[PDB]
Amino acid sequence: YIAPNPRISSITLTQRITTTGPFAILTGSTPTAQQLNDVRKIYLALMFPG
């Protein structure tokens, strides 16, 4: 699983340092063990439509 360029979050989501929002509050969170498995489940559901 690859991750995007960090600069996307540095020029847009955290552009203003004096304000916060729902998107900026979780842009730093990191997944646990079960959440990665949930991501795997999402992709498996995508690969077999219907």
Binding site: P6, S9, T14, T27, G28, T30, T32
Partner: peptide, 19 residues
């Protein structure tokens, strides 16, 4: 001016637990 993830990575290099 660093972000959250930068600090998280620095603390991982400090051997600290991720949570």
């Amino acid at each position: 001016n660093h972000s959250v993830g930068d600090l998280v990575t620095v603390f991982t290099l400090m051997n600290i637990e991720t949570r």
